[PDB]
Amino acid sequence: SWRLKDETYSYDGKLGADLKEEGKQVDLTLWSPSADKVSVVVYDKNDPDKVVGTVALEKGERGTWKQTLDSTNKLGITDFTGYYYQYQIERQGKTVLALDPYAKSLAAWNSDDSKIDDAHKVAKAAFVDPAKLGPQDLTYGKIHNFKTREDAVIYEAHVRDFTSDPAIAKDLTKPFGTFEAFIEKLDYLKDLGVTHIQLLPVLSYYFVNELKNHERLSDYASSNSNYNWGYDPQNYFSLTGMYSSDPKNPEKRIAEFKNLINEIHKRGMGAILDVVYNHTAKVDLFEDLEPNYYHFMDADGTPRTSFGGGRLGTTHHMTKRLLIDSIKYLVDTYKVDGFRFDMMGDHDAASIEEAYKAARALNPNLIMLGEGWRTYAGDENMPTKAADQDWMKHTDTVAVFSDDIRNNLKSGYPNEGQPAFITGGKRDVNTIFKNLIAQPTNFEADSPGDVIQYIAAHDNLTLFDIIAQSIKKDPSKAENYAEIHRRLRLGNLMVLTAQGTPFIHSGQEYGRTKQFRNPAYRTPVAEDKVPNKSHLLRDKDGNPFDYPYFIHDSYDSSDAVNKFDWTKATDGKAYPENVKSRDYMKGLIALRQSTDAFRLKSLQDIKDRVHLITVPGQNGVEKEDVVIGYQITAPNGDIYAVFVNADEKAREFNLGTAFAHLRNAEVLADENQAGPVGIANPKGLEWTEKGLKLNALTATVLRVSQNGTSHEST
């Protein structure tokens, strides 16, 4: 029983291998209460296959094992730095090789060798001292335009994707797809105006061959690729080697990642780490350490499983401190600015709340968010409050993604690809309004800061591709490309002016695609050739698009699928529509940052200040429609208004006497541009007798500045 094991062996002392005396000594502590013996196997720093020696540990308090390696070793080592190790643990006459769960770095890891021998089944840890690596001045972000969670603008990027486009090889001075190559494209992000860059999992993950990390994955593939998003966790303190200049040097990834974080900070941004504590890649990672303990279990003690590995049981004392120690070590070592929890609804609320508190005590401006789906499994017959969307009414700490706004604007599970608000499918106007004020309909958000507002992310089809599928129009036709971009800008404007915390998938700003443009796949292929995780996109007549296969889950896809396209993102001669959308997103960000009208800090303040103008059923607005219009009274007394016409015809928005004051407003966004300065000659708008008319697929934002108003009418 894990609960009984806790009463008898709950240990709160230090764990891991602490490299001491400029490398002359190492102190080792492992928790393994059921072990009969525990030795450390030391592998050579130059040839990790070679065992240099094995040293017995001795029993310590509360189920731990401990040893000091020093001067007096007969390993022939005078500096331990860079040597590798595993624990050899004996139980009931059986011996296993286990990974130190508190390993601070690792040997280059290649899962294609995992069957060779027991020493290859899991990574080997490295003795390293992170404090002495990287910029010694690294500290927490001083993040521009940011005071509290509602002021964050999050940008979700995978480290490889962000510099894996062969088109930028000419400009890169560091190995593509690494932490230091990422630095070289940071100015684009500073210029975009985002506040926090959320990176896909940088902690060590299992299914990958890090020895091929400099190889270009240039053939289209959507399965069996060396590429990995990283959701197959191996260790919660060590960085993967996949984004390192040299995976074989266990200190380099740490220095390089410190350098990356410091450069993000120098540019006035912060870093958020995607972390995957909900499950490990392999049951044995932790079962080999202590049997029938670390994972959520059936009543008989069988480890419960998720994504092919063990569900970590964060209610259990040593699993709880694994999560918490990991969060603290990552904040203090790498000075990050927040975390995004994967499958956060799998965890007990108490763990997630305690991680938040611990992290904030180190970095008082740190923020968190997570996938709050209702997914809790836990221990059999041990119901527990989970850190899911229903936790939001009980806490004002960690936010959750809002599937209500994503689904209602452009579809999501179940029902992916069904027309929705920006894709030709009428939706309940009050449901759209409530979402835009950070009041989703599927959970109770009693703070706009509880709500991460988004329409695209790394999973599912990209905003560009899901729009193309939904409206059923082939982007290879110029007029359809333009239309898709109109709809993408409208969706982006809805999110960037919504209450709550907006979240931007890397590439959403320009209309990134995951179309499987393999020359052999121009037209539909035989069923046994169909690319894994694809949809075959069709026009309204049911004709395939040109290159009809689009990847909707690119977790196991090559760079040809996953690269961020820098030519579409930045070369406005070659791709004027994409760059126009990018610049539309930059301006929308600048618009949001210019006023706190779009980022009110309480529910009560949103109730007082935000009012629906397009009342469903009145004045040409149907109960369910593809238009919406609303007003905000900003805290300084200025009046903003957002109007969206997602119909394929011109639509009128009725102002009457109640909203007549919007007639002498500056236009901050129109069909071409967005930003904080009034647009000289606004396009797509027409003032009429009843109010305001927008062109088809057009959105606008208005501002009335009280400093230009009458002294007498008052």
Closer Cβ to Ca ion, 348 or 556, answer by number: 556
Task: Kindly tell me which residue out of 113, 416, 446, 605 binds Na ion, with binding defined by CB under 5 A.
Answer: 416
The two structure tokens encoding residue 334:
């790498």
Closer Cβ to Na ion, 347 or 568, answer by number: 568
Partner that binds at residue 505, options Ca ion, Na ion, none, CB closer than 5 to 8 Å by kind: Na ion
CB of 388 to Ca ion, least distance (A): 28
Task: List binders of Na ion among 453-482 (CB under 5 A).
Answer: 456, 460-463
Stretch that binds Ca ion, among 162-170, 490-498, 545-553, 556-564 (CB under 5 A): 556-564
Closer Cβ to Ca ion, 222 or 228, answer by number: 228
Query: Coil, strand, or helix at residue 365?
Result: coil
Secondary structure string (H, E, C) spanning 171-193: CCCCCCCCHHHHHCCHHHHHHHC
Rg of the chain on CA atoms, in Å: 27
In which residue are the tokens 């026009």 written?
A: 539
Closer Cβ to Ca ion, 501 or 554, answer by number: 554
Instruction: Please name the amino acid found at residue 215.
Output: E
Element (H, E) at 599: none
Question: What's the distance, CA 696 to chain centroid?
Answer: 33
Partner that binds at residue 278, options Na ion, Ca ion, none, CB closer than 5 to 8 Å by kind: none
Instruction: Please name the amino acid found at residue 246.
Output: D
Element (H, E) at 19: strand 16-20
Of residues 210, 256, 342, 670, which has the active-site annotation?
A: 342
Instruction: Compose the 261-280 pattern: x for residues touching Ca ion by CB under 5 A, - for all others.
Output: --------------------
- Compute the distance between CA of residue 666 and CA of residue 678 in angstroms, rounded to an integer: 5
- Buried b / exposed e along 416-429 (16+ C-beta atoms within 10 A): bbebbbbbbbbbbb
Task: List binders of Na ion among 339-358 (CB under 5 A).
Answer: none
Closer Cβ to Na ion, 156 or 251, answer by number: 156
- Compute the distance between CA of residue 482 and CA of residue 479 in angstroms, rounded to an integer: 5
Burial zone of 103 (CB within 10 Å; 0-12 exposed, 13-18 middle, 19+ buried): buried
- Compute the distance between CA of residue 710 and CA of residue 714 in angstroms, rounded to an integer: 8
Helices (H) and strands (E) in the chain, counts: 15, 32
CB of 217 to Na ion, least distance (A): 20
Q: How is 395-443 classified by DSSP, letter by letter?
A: -SSSEEE-HHHHHHHH--SSSTT---TTTT--EEHHHHHHHHTT--TTS
CB of 219 to Ca ion, least distance (A): 14
CB of 512 to Na ion, least distance (A): 5
Instruction: Please name the amino acid found at residue 595.
Output: T
Question: Does residue 337 have an active-site annotation?
Answer: no
Partner that binds at residue 228, options Ca ion, Na ion, none, CB closer than 5 to 8 Å by kind: Ca ion
- Compute the distance between CA of residue 182 and CA of residue 618 in angstroms, rounded to an integer: 51
Partner that binds at residue 460, options Na ion, Ca ion, none, CB closer than 5 to 8 Å by kind: Na ion
Q: How is 142-165 classified by DSSP, letter by letter?
A: --TT-SSGGG--EEEE-TTGGG--
Select from 520, 519, 513, 505 the least CA-distant residue to 557. 513
The two structure tokens encoding residue 633:
């009274």
Instruction: Compose the 25-54 pattern: x for residues touching Ca ion by CB under 5 A, - for all others.
Output: ------------------------------
CB of 205 to Ca ion, least distance (A): 10
Strand 627-633 and strand 37-43: the pairing is unpaired
- Compute the distance between CA of residue 339 and CA of residue 480 in angstroms, rounded to an integer: 38
Task: Kindly tell me which residue out of 353, 474, 556, 577 binds Ca ion, with binding defined by CB under 5 A.
Answer: 556
CB of 652 to Ca ion, least distance (A): 52
- Buried b / exposed e along 644-657 (16+ C-beta atoms within 10 A): bbbbeeebbbbbee
452 forms beta bridges with 401, 501
Of residues 371, 404, 565, 583, which has the active-site annotation?
A: 371
Query: Coil, strand, or helix at residue 628?
Result: strand
Partner that binds at residue 556, options Ca ion, Na ion, none, CB closer than 5 to 8 Å by kind: Ca ion
Say if residues 406 and 452 touch (Cβ distance below 8 Å).
no
Strand 691-694 and strand 685-687: the pairing is antiparallel
How many residues bind to Ca ion according to rule CB under 5 A? 3
In which residue are the tokens 């109770």 written?
A: 444
Taken in order 683, 684, 688, 691, is the CA torsion positive or negative?
A: negative
The two structure tokens encoding residue 370:
């997570």
Partner that binds at residue 462, options Ca ion, Na ion, none, CB closer than 5 to 8 Å by kind: Na ion
Task: List binders of Na ion among 493-552 (CB under 5 A).
Answer: 505, 507-508, 512, 552
Say if residues 501 and 569 touch (Cβ distance below 8 Å).
no
Closer Cβ to Ca ion, 84 or 109, answer by number: 109
Select from 439, 460, 438 the least CA-distant residue to 507. 460
∠ Cα 645 651 654 (to 5°): 100
Say if residues 54 and 42 touch (Cβ distance below 8 Å).
yes
Stretch that binds Na ion, among 28-36, 112-120, 128-136, 415-423 (CB under 5 A): 415-423
How many residues bind to Na ion according to rule CB under 5 A? 11
Check residue 553 for interaction with Na ion (CB under 5 A).
no
In which residue are the tokens 């780490």 written?
A: 273
Task: List binders of Ca ion among 220-239 (CB under 5 A).
Answer: 225, 228
Question: Does residue 553 have an active-site annotation?
Answer: no
- Buried b / exposed e along 181-199 (16+ C-beta atoms within 10 A): bbbbbbebbeebbbbbbbb
Binding site for Na ion (CB under 5 A): 416, 456, 460-463, 505, 507-508, 512, 552
Residues binding Ca ion (CB under 5 A)? 225, 228, 556
Catalytic positions are 342, 371
